[PDB]
Design a protein around this nucleic acid. Structure first.
Lengths: 171, 37, 212, 146, 24, 61
RNA sequence: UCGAGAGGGAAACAGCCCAGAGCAUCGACUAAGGCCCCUAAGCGUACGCUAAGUGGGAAAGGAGCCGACAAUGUA
RNA sequence: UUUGGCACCUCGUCGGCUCGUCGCAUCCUGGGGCUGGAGUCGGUCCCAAGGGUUGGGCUGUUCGCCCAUUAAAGCGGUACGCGAGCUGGGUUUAGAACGUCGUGAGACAGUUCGGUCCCUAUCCGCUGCGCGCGCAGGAACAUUGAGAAGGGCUGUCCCUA
RNA sequence: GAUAACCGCUGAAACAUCUAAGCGGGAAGCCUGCUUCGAGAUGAGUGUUCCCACCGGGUAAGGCUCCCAGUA
């Protein structure tokens, strides 16, 4: 795995603890843990090692490293997903920790914030989702985008920041 | 999505992948989505 | 889920007239007074429940095993016992009296009782089967079941097929009956509808199992 | 002379405990059925029960290879039409492990009126605690020979 | 209908046992 | 015979072969009569059957 | 070969595989077929392949897999 | 599941009613992909068998056409399910007539009018109800729930507009 | 609660990938929840109370038989 070979770099201010196969990284923004699947092993130079050159071993090699790198960036800087609202009358307001959405529905949508995920409202057509765990941040952004898929005739609904929607010529 | 035992690429952008033991083609042109079965 | 309950005795049916002048056929239930005689729990008996004893019986027709079971709770011996499967059985206490007015106007209840007996009911009366027509020459099968299965495959009458047998006289629970009025003086319950069982039977009235 | 056939009193049953912690389900059943049938001692006969009681702790952690957890069913028909009810071992082993181990061993035993008497000598439990502490059970390891 | 087979002695006697009088 | 032999850590597969290579052929009828009553005698016969086997049993003959 | 053929195996299964029953035997070696438990004998030793319960059914064709799909109840 | 071929078991056919039961190759209802999907409604395909799937005119009719509705008026297996459950309209007896064939007796997957549908349930099976014994002291009362059965249908109008 | 088709987050084998490790959403369907039967569940269960340690037999607690009836 070309990806697996690349060594990992740990910026200053990050405390990494390796207890067997489970790695716990302490950063300035929080702490994360993961049990690496066997037989992949990790040593602090962080370099990820693999016993043999089996097909599965190669896949696990790259996969395991990528997860580790994500935490190091996630605890240091973090992940923010920007979402933009396009349409007519569609606005987003922040009510404390929750978000009120009005995507042209009969009732307003109150989306709750999962533990460890914060919401930022720059504008009533632009908002971002900050968080430390990449999977969770991506999961929340996808769920919020599921509320109203973008129409193929007028691109009405929520979409990812800079996400190029293909428009169809309504007949 | 088109369900056909014969699953082939139709344009270059088509990518043949194996998901859940089933071979399918994913492409930007939604018409070219294909599933084998 | 919490469930309040009380034993009663269907007395008959009559009609009333609500303020909007709508005839409301009610059944008079003489529910109460009944006393808790035993409280089960997770540890002692595995589950959570509450017995309540309703009835009037002279102490001379009660055998000693029951006469000693009543004396543990310090209540005069009654004649009927039941358990209400509740979830808050720890709030009761032995001897506590559950009056008729446990329910108030408007609440929905689930009345239960032994339905009226019907004897050895025939095929039509017990499963609403059709007949073979009175006319057009039907030979002594005007009310027969009909067929009861197919030919050599499977060559067997399926289990659970509908025959004629003893009808009625089995436990039945009518649901979401409305408690019209609760006359706390006599200890009655005017319930809109038709509770199961004949006049004088032993009905049970507990809170709506559904809608909670 | 005639070959010895055991009389009622030549048998001295023992108590074995088989910790099933991450031990293949099929290899647990075969080992438990051997002891249960009394087919490991020289006093065996094919018409008398000579086996030993077999307690089974940790019956909820039986390792199952491959995709069995999500593919192998456990069918049960009731007699009424459309009465077949099946259960995936992911569900079965989640909340009724003891009922799945005991079913496996039952199949690995004669289906006559004696195999049901043998099968009554097998106690299955999900925890590390078995109430049969007054029978002085002896831990029984699973080993192979040369 | 007609009896398909001669009833076995065991089955015949199982039934006639039920045809007994009660002690007064 | 197999049950008693496995109590002494020799499978019936090879306890018989060893007996052949010791020319101590003794009928199963009575070879199984020793296991039940006289365990010592049967224990003394597995010893002979084990020492009459080749060192490595799977190497080419 | 059965018909006119017992016995062992293929779960059951005249015609398939092994084998031709004078009678007795609480001895031994084998044939086809097998040796985790039902059920006699290997959880055999060593190397390699399969991830589909393939083994434990099938085609053109497509990239061991898909193609795969009927009626009482797993079947 | 059709029309057939073989001739291996055994010298009342159909239709309707009653009662089921099962398959999904789904008619409705539920979920979804694509659309030559602006919206309402559609087309095709994928998942899905829990329930539901009307009443009449003609014909013995299955079938088929039609009428009025319906969310829908599904296709099949089960001895083309079901006559020791019912009918007996067509069809396979004897009477009679028409057309055609035959010299004639008569014949015709041509037509027409009429034309006997038996049985007291032994066994299994199914629906209910008891008797005996068991469950290591004997009893009264109330219950846990391993398992099993039942139910699972759907429309119109108003607000949102 | 878990799922079908399907829709995704992170992600390699080798940027991309809903998958090869994992994590979600997702059907009148599956399991529960509702009603009823239910320890002959021979694995024959649990609880409260009562009788009391006699000599094949008499008994205790409690039943059964008989009679008047129905809520049968």
């Amino acid at each position: 795995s070309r990806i697996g070979k690349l060594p990992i770099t740990v910026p200053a201010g990050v405390d990494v603890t390796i207890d067997g196969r489970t790695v716990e990284v302490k950063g300035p923004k929080g702490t994360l843990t993961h049990t690496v699947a066997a037989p992949i092993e990790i040593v602090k130079g962080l370099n990820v090692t693999r016993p043999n050159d089996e097909r599965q071993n190669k896949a696990l090699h790259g996969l395991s490293r990528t997860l580790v790198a994500n935490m190091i960036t996630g605890v240091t800087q973090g992940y923010t997903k920007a979402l933009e609202i396009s349409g007519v009358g569609y606005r987003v307001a922040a009510k404390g920790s929750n978000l009120e959405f009005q995507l042209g529905y009969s009732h307003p949508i109150l989306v709750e914030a999962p533990e460890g995920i914060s919401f930022k409202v720059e504008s009533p057509t632009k908002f971002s989702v900050e968080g430390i765990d990449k999977q969770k941040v991506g999961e929340v952004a996808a769920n919020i985008r599921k509320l109203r898929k973008p129409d193929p005739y007028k691109a009405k609904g929520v979409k990812y920041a800079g996400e190029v929607i293909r428009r169809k010529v309504g007949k | 999505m088109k369900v056909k035992p014969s699953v082939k690429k139709i344009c270059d952008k088509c990518k043949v992948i194996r998901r859940h033991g089933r071979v399918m083609v994913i492409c930007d042109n939604l018409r070219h989505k294909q599933r084998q079965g | 889920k919490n469930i309040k309950g009380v034993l009663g005795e269907k007395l008959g049916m009559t009609q009333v007239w609500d303020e909007n002048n709508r005839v409301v056929p009610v059944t008079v239930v003489k529910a109460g007074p009944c006393v808790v005689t035993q409280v089960r729990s997770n540890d002692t008996d595995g589950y959570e429940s509450v017995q309540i004893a309703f009835g009037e019986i002279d102490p001379r027709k009660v055998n000693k095993p029951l006469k000693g079971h009543f004396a543990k709770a310090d209540v005069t011996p009654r004649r009927h016992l039941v358990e209400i499967r509740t979830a808050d059985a720890s709030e009761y206490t032995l001897g506590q009296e559950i009056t008729a007015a446990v329910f108030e106007a408007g609440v929905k209840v689930d009345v239960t009782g032994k339905s009226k007996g019907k004897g050895f009911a025939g095929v039509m009366k017990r499963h609403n089967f059709r007949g073979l027509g009175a006319g057009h020459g039907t030979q002594r099968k005007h009310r027969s079941p009909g067929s009861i299965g197919g030919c050599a495959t499977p060559g067997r009458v399926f289990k659970g097929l509908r025959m004629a047998g003893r009808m009625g006289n089995e436990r039945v629970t009518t649901q979401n009956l409305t408690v019209h009025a609760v006359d706390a003086e006599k200890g009655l319950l005017l319930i809109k509808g038709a509770v199961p069982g004949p006049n004088g039977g032993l009905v049970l009235v507990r809170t709506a199992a559904k809608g909670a | 002379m005639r070959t010895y056939s055991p009389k009622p009193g030549d048998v001295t049953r023992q108590w074995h405990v088989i910790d099933a912690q991450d031990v293949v389900l099929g290899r647990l059943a075969t080992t438990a059925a051997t002891l249960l049938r009394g087919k490991h001692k020289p006093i065996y006969a094919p018409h008398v029960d000579a086996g030993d009681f077999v307690i089974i702790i940790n019956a909820d952690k039986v390792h199952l290879s491959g995709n069995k957890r999500t593919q192998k069913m456990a069918y049960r028909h009731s007699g009424y039409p459309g009465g077949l009810r099946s259960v995936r071992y992911d569900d079965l082993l989640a909340n009724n492990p003891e009922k799945a181990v005991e079913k496996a061993v039952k199949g690995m035993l004669p289906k006559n009126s004696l195999g049901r008497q043998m099968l009554s000598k097998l106690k299955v439990y999900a925890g590390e605690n078995h109430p049969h502490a007054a029978q002085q059970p002896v831990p029984f390891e699973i080993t192979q020979v040369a | 209908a007609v009896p398909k087979r001669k009833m076995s002695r065991s089955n015949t006697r199982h039934r006639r046992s039920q045809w007994k009088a009660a002690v007064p | 015979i197999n049950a008693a032999a496995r109590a002494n850590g020799i499978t019936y597969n090879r306890f018989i072969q060893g007996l052949k290579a010791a020319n101590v052929e003794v009928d199963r009828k009575i070879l199984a009569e020793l296991a039940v009553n006289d365990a010592n005698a049967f224990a003394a016969l597995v010893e002979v059957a084990q020492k009459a086997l080749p060192s490595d049993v799977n190497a080419p003959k």
